Amino acid sequence: IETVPVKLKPGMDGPKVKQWPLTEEKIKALVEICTEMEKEGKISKIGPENPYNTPVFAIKKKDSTKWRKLVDFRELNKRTQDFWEVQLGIPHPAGLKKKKSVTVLDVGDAYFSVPLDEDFRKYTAFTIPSINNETPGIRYQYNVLPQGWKGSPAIFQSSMTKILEPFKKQNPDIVIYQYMDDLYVGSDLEIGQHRTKIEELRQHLLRWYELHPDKWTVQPIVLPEKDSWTVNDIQKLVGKLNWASQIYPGIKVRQLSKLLRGTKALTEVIPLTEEAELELAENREILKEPVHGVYYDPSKDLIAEIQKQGQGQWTYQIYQEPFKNLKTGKYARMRGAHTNDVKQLTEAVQKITTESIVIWGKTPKFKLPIQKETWETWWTEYWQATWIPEWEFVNTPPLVKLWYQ
Amino acid sequence: MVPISPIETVPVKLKPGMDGPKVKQWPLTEEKIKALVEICTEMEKEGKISKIGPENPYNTPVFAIWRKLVDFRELNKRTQDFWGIPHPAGLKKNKSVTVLDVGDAYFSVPLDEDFRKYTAFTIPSINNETPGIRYQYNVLPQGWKGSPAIFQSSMTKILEPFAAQNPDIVICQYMDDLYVGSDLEIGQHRTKIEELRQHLLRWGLTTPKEPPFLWMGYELHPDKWTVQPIVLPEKDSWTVNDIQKLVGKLNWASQIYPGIKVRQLSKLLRGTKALTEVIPLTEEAELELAENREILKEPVHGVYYDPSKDLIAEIQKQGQGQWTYQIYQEPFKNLKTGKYARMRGAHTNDVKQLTEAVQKITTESIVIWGKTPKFKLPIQKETWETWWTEYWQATWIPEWEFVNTPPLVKLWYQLEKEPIVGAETFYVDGAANRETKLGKAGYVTNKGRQKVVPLTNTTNQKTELQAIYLALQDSGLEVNIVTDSQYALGIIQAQPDKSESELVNQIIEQLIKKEKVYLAWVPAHKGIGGNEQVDKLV
Ligand SMILES: N#C/C=C/c1cc(Cl)cc(Oc2ccccc2OCCn2ccc(=O)[nH]c2=O)c1
């Protein structure tokens, strides 16, 4: 109802970012949606005097045939002044990742009831493109708070506090966190009772996705158990172990390598010795312990690496410094993704990003095992998420792929 | 007098920290001065400019060529910042098409009243014995930075309600011009054109060419489109500018004419940095340009786009990292064509390049037609299957069918997932002295077969590749190779079918000859048995 003044960081101007091509149906959807939004005063047309531009496209969320408008605010988000509030830099609710169940809700309907600081509005400018440049693209700017901006939930923190005040006091055992346009709600309850409580909460929102963090995995490094070892087996073992020696200090491969001495066929069976078995055992025990001195630094960037294992399976690692992992994991999930690598990759990136948002309260920077052009061409078609993480592209195959399989 | 609807001005500012332009007026001849005085007088009578006094310290220079020329350059530097061509193949066929380019465009649209003081200029009087005459612009000046954007924005604003009231016609807006197509009867269409230009007359926009249209280097005919004739320069001396111009022109001609090859010519331009240097051509290049003039012999036209039909793109491999494509709806009638050159890289394969081409064509299509075309590709379904399933990278191509039009894209070798039973096991290694550039490369096997080859002018990576090559040469149809090289394995895991490194290519051919190859890796200097650092290091 009253606009809190917002500016950019010192020295930085408003985002000017090229609008990328859009399909005909997406353009139509955006046209209809924005035509509806203009009547409601949410956005207003602008003239040539506003050089700033931000990318925009359209998607379809889960279990819905209705197109949704998605703005890519990344450049604006980083150019937006770092938002510190009277919240005093709220510490992430670490009790969230420890919860039995967590439900993700979309609160983005609320941001449109709050007007935006006038001088800042020119920075929210976007363009609906036309096919084949036959007509100039339709340009709008946001009068209210746009979804996807990092300043919107920051400004709406107080209102959201006043709205969610009764629910939190009624049942204090329910954890609540807010990121962007999405609201995460944790509970230890039963799935049915969970869903009913969710209905209670959303109807509580009205008058003013199911995750399981406890079922989430932190993967250790495992070695094979065999009655019979071949030369190839032992060579692979020594490889993985020598790799793990970077992570774990006390790993020693010498007595295992001692078995390989001479030139033997890869398929030839090599029986282990007492020294060898002992060494392998000690290595196992070393691997069963966690990593020495692994910590999370909020002043550092999170990095997510993803490897494609094939057969619809993907592995991943979230970390800050090399060979120190904050998390590792695996995604085998198959829904309609069987014949498409890029769709799988996209859903994987979404899952990993969501988990990252739950644990550290911020998205990581992905290193994707895909060519820039392929990804950039196809990623928006499979993308159901309202937030967009940063990413880069690794074009050299890692040797570390089968070491996580 | 019927009142003309007012055009609301656009608020304009300058860049922060910078003030308006102040520049002296250059000396002009007497004829220039008189002509400028006359022109400015009649313009002032038209109401496009107005006289000003001493209160305006800002001065923009002027000239005469009669036509007045105002130089806004410095102002263009101090003015604020404001906000591709339509492709004929994307145009949907209409029975009637009218072209209207508003005459005296920028002057028809007013200027921000609080801005006008900055643009003001000065006409020097005779002998400089009198204070120069002072004028300021009341409208958008020709040559200003912010004129086109304001003009087109106003034009769009005015045009908006007419198109809504006339959904049965389609209007395209490029810069100063409007293009109105309709499927109605020519009498109807003409009348609606009259209605439109009346609608533009209400806001005071003056409007008036018939098919074919010469537009943006194209030629537009009612049922078909093409490009304006390309001028191919001939000479006994080919300079760098000749190569740039020919590359641009051939690229421009490639959208319609199939089979245009710019490769050699583009190779001639590497690190030139010379305004004048000549350069001879290879026989491949001469045959290339001769076949180019052969392709430019009998001209062909592109057709327009019909939304009710499928959009299809067919790709052919031209060889030497070159690809070509045709986008069409019905057989033998092309909407447009094009080419794809491979990105600069050390190693690569046909499948990758084909994928990249598909991505490119996809993007271009989404720009032009607003959708992704169906593909006809010279690759077997099984080939693509094996490729994308066994590739370490995520990859996808949209909906496509296999067309058999050789050469076909194929996979030339496949490495085993598991070690081969019965196959001999070659443990290979190589090393070199960084100082003397002398090294050794070789192998030892389980059957006692050994080789060590001494090498001059080499490096570790070269000797490791060489070692693998020696393993491939001396081994039977099925072989297991063990290497300590993360580099060699890095190269072979990327599956190149061609490389700019001859050693790698020889390795590739060797692999092609093989029935089964299993490549295994071990850490060096860990004393893994069979892995011999000692033979190569002497
Ligand atoms: N100078 C000049 C003109 C340039 C020009 C530029 C553009 Cl973006 C479009 C244009 O013509 C059209 C305008 C509105 C709708 C469809 C159109 O074209 C559809 C295809 N078509 C082209 C020519 C013709 O005679 N008949 C025909 O059907 C003309």
Instruction: Please name the residues in contact with B264: beta carbons below 8 A apart, sequence gap of 6 or more.
Output: B281, B282, B284, B285, B288
Testing the interface with B: which of A23, A133, A246 to mutate, by most B Cβ within 10 A? A133
Quote the CA–CA distance of B229 and A389 in Å, as a whole number: 48
d(CA B147, ligand 1 centre) in Å: 25
In sign, the C-alpha dihedral spanning A85, A87, A91, A92 is negative
For ligand 1, whether the C-beta of B97 sits within 6 Å is yes
Regarding the beta carbon of B37 and ligand 1, being less than 6 Å apart is answered no
Give the span between the Cα atoms of B498 and B414, in whole angstroms. Answer: 15
Give the residue on A whose Cα is nearest the Cα of B361: A377
The structure was resolved to a resolution in Å of 3.0
Please give the CATH number for the structural domain made up of B212-305: 3.30.70.270
B84-106+148-211 belongs to which homologous superfamily?
Reverse transcriptase/Diguanylate cyclase domain (3.30.70.270)
User: Count of residues for chain A?
Assistant: 405
User: What share of residues in chain B are helix, strand, coil (percent, to 5)?
Assistant: 30, 25, 45
Distance CA A1, CA A116 (A): 9
Tell me if B148 CB under 6 Å of ligand 1.
no
Nearest 5°: CA angle at A225, between A223 and A228? 125
Is B87 in Cβ contact with A374 (below 8 Å)?
A: no
Selecting from B149, B523, B529 the residue whose C-beta is nearest the C-beta of A261 gives B529
In angstroms, what is the C-alpha Rg of chain B?
A: 34
Closest to A16 in 3D by CA, of A69, A76, A72, A58: A76
Strand pairing class (B478-483; B333-341): unpaired
Alpha helices in B27-78 (DSSP H): 30-46, 73-78
Q: Is the distance from CB of B397 to CB of B358 less than 8 angstroms?
A: yes
Radius of gyration for the alpha carbons in chain A, expressed in angstroms and rounded: 25
Q: What's the rounded Cα separation, in Å, for the pair B49 and B31?
A: 21
Look up residue B323 and give its amino acid.
W
CATH label, B413-538, candidates 3.30.420.10, 3.40.50.80, 3.40.50.1980, 3.20.20.150: 3.30.420.10
Architecture field, domain B1-83+107-147: Roll (3.10)
**Contact between residue A146 and residue A65 where contact means Cβ atoms under 8 Å apart:** no
Q: Among B85, B99, B172, say which to mutate for ligand 1: greatest number of ligand atoms within 8 Å of CB.
A: B172
Helical (H) or strand (E) element with B313: strand B312-319
Experimental method: X-ray
**CA B180 to ligand 1 center in whole angstroms:** 7
Among B354, B392, B534, the strongest candidate for a mutation testing the A interface, having the largest count of A CBs within 10 A, is: B392
Tokens of A163: 């709205």
Strands B133-137 and B49-51: antiparallel
Interchain contact, A48 vs B389, CB within 8 Å: no
Tokens of A338: 């069987």
* SS3 of residue A78 by DSSP: helix
CA-nearest residue, atom 22 of ligand 1:
B222
> CB contact, 8 Å: A241 with chain B?
no
Find all residues with CB under 8 Å of A54, minimum gap 6, and list them: A15, A17, A71, A72, A73, A75, A76, A124, A125, A126
Q: From the CB of B107, is ligand 1 less than 6 Å away? A: no
Interface touch B10/A132, C-beta < 8 Å: no
> Could you give the angle at the alpha carbon of A298 between the alpha carbons of A294 and A300, nearest 5°?
80
d(CA B32, CA B38): 10
Q: Residue B221's closest CA among B209, B213, B229?
A: B213
All structural domains of chain A, each given as residue ranges with its CATH number in brackets, are 5-94+120-160 (3.10.10.10), 95-119+161-210 (3.30.70.270), 211-296 (3.30.70.270), 297-405 (3.30.70.270)
Compare CB distances from B396 to A22, A368, A378 and report the shortest one's residue.
A378
Can you name the CATH fold of B306-412? Answer: Alpha-Beta Plaits (3.30.70)
If one counts every other C-beta atom within 10 angstroms of the C-beta of residue B275, the result is 8
Q: Confirm whether B84-106+148-211 and B212-305 share one CATH topology.
A: yes
Neighbours of B1 (CB within 10 A): 3
Instruction: Give the Å distance between the CA of B306 and the centre of ligand 1.
Output: 14
Task: Tell me which residue in A21, A268, A397 faces B392 most closely, judged by beta carbons.
Answer: A397
Half-sphere exposure at residue A209, Cβ-oriented, CA atoms within 13 angstroms: 18
Strands, E, within A278-385: which ranges? 303-310, 313-319, 325-331, 365-368
Q: For residue A27, what is the enclosing H or E element?
A: helix A24-39
Q: Is the CB of B176 under 6 A from ligand 1?
A: no
**A313 vs B: CB within 8 A:** no
Q: Tell me the nearest-neighbour CA distance from B407 into chain A, angstroms.
A: 24
Ligand 1 and B94: CB distance under 6 A? yes
* Gap from CA of B96 to ligand 1 centroid (Å): 9
Region of residue A310 (phi > 0: left; psi between -120 and 50: alpha; otherwise: beta): left
Domain ranges of chain B: 1-83+107-147, 84-106+148-211, 212-305, 306-412, 413-538
Q: Which atom of ligand 1 is nearest to the CA of B212?
A: 25
Are A342 and B395 in contact by the 8 Å Cβ rule? The answer is: yes
A245 touches chain B (CB under 8 A): no
Determine, for residues B394 and A342 on separate chains, whether the beta-carbon distance falls below 8 Å: yes
The alpha carbon of B310 and the centre of ligand 1 are apart by a number of angstroms equal to: 22
Q: Is B212 helix (H, G, I), strand (E, B) or coil?
A: coil
